[PDB]
Design a protein around this ligand. Structure first.
Ligand code: MYA
Lengths: 8, 394
């Protein structure tokens, strides 16, 4: 979905 | 001139492009349900003008060479994490899955090339989707894969791409769209957050995708995330062709409880769920009576690890649609983790939408730094909590 997340 | 990650930071920002578009303003609260503007009965026939030296080109993804050019554009220029450490690495065969579902149109695979070299430097796509939003079902498109080459950024090429795909969708009689992004734009209908479940914690920590929890050793971290070798749910097996109708039935009934969902035909269910190795995995629960009562699914989307001498890629699974009627959702997702570990994934990602908050903390997911904002184009409706979003994009 056009959002690259990684853990905070 | 730069993007925003938070709603308070975005409220001090100016949106020169999005102020011109039929979307609600970031500041106003939406009290109604319906289109922002009436449908147009005359549509611009000519493509929007690109800056000098660039040309439109519709990409035939059935041509292996052209598909590979798109793979390379995305591999080198698509979305990164906010620290510029990882980049999506959609595979060619995944791209074909995501871009040629039932009803796909060639003009909706909208490329930009340099005239002289033919180098592909821009892309945007639309695919058709029937969308249920509160009490309205409507034909829309889903926009995805908006990408501008790094060397062409900050030159107002993205607004031209958006207007050109809008025009091409208008020509087919469609006036609403759904899309997602990690940045805040006018105006989110829902705000979701990615969570991450470590499967290979040693690799994830070495590449600094993850970090050691406060007062936790690596040994402890390995034991914490250890999973069984095989799933536990009786009768769990891969989806087969004979399961297409019941998977469609289960999904359709399950999605009624949310406020933003797809409405899939049986052919769309076949496309989005029938297993394809290294693209989409779907497992059904066939019980002691031979009835399919549940299913889990997740898609394959690795990332490039930028500038790393040894580890070049991270294999990630993304939670797709998980439907439970007889098996607890917690057990279903536990088995999804076991299956992903078995298939070599390094991490399992899931959003906090649908009922996912009921299992995220229990199954040792950790919260991510990325929001996933959901948006509708030319549709006014009140925002909703993440738990009411029932739509997952590729
Ligand atoms: C009826 C049918 C309707 C169909 C259309 C429905 C709408 C679809 C809308 C698109 C849905 C995409 C959904 C998925 O694909 S999200 C995928 C987004 N892709 C990436 O993040 C890939 C990596 N980044 C890039 O390739 C570029 O940085 C992009 C292309 C993102 C911007 O290139 P660049 O950095 O060179 O910017 P610019 O100078 O050309 O132009 C900046 C203007 O554009 C606004 N902007 C920035 N990012 C986005 C964004 N992600 N969605 C919408 N707008 C965005 C920006 O705020 C500013 O507007 P304003 O701030 O002045 O107002």
């Amino acid at each position: 979905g056009a959002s690259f997340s990684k853990p905070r | 001139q730069g993007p925003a990650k938070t709603m308070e930071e975005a409220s001090k920002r100016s949106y020169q492009f999005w102020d011109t578009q039929p979307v609600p303003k970031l500041g106003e609260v939406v009290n109604t349900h319906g289109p922002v503007e009436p449908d147009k009965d005359n549509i611009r026939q000519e493509p929007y003008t690109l800056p000098q030296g660039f040309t439109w080109d519709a990409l035939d993804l059935g041509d292996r060479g052209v598909l590979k050019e798109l793979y390379t554009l995305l591999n080198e220029n698509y979305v990164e994490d906010d620290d510029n450490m990882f980049r999506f690495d959609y595979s060619p065969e995944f791209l074909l899955w995501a871009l040629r579902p039932p009803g796909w149109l060639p003009q909706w695979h909208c490329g930009v090339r340099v005239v002289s070299s033919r180098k592909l430097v821009g892309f945007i796509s639309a695919i058709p989707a029937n969308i249920h939003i509160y009490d309205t079902e409507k034909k829309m498109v889903e926009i995805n894969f908006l990408c501008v080459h790094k060397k062409l950024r900050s030159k107002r090429v993205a607004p031209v791409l958006i207007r050109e795909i809008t025009r091409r969708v208008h020509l087919e009689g469609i006036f609403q769209a759904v899309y997602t992004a990690g940045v805040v734009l006018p105006k989110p209908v829902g705000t979701c957050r990615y969570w991450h479940r470590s499967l290979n914690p040693r690799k994830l920590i070495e590449v600094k995708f993850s970090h050691l929890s406060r007062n936790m050793t690596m040994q402890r971290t390995m034991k914490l995330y250890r999973l069984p070798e095989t799933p536990k749910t009786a009768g769990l097996r891969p989806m087969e062709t004979k399961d297409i109708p019941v998977v469609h039935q289960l999904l359709t009934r399950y999605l009624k409880q949310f406020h933003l969902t797809p409405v899939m035909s049986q052919e769309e269910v076949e496309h989005w769920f029938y297993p394809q190795e290294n693209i989409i995995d779907t497992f059904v629960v066939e019980n002691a009576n031979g009835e399919v009562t549940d299913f889990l699914s997740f898609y394959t989307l690795p990332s490039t690890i930028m500038n790393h001498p040894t580890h070049k890629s991270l294999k990630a699974a993304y939670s797709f649609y998980n439907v439970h009627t007889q098996t607890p959702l917690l057990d279903l997702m536990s088995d999804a983790l076991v299956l992903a570990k078995m298939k070599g994934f390094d991490v399992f990602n899931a959003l906090d939408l649908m009922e996912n908050k009921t299992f995220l903390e229990k199954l040792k997911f950790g919260i991510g730094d990325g929001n996933l904002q959901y948006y509708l184009y030319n549709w006014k409706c009140p925002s909703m909590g993440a738990e009411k979003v029932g739509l997952v994009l590729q």
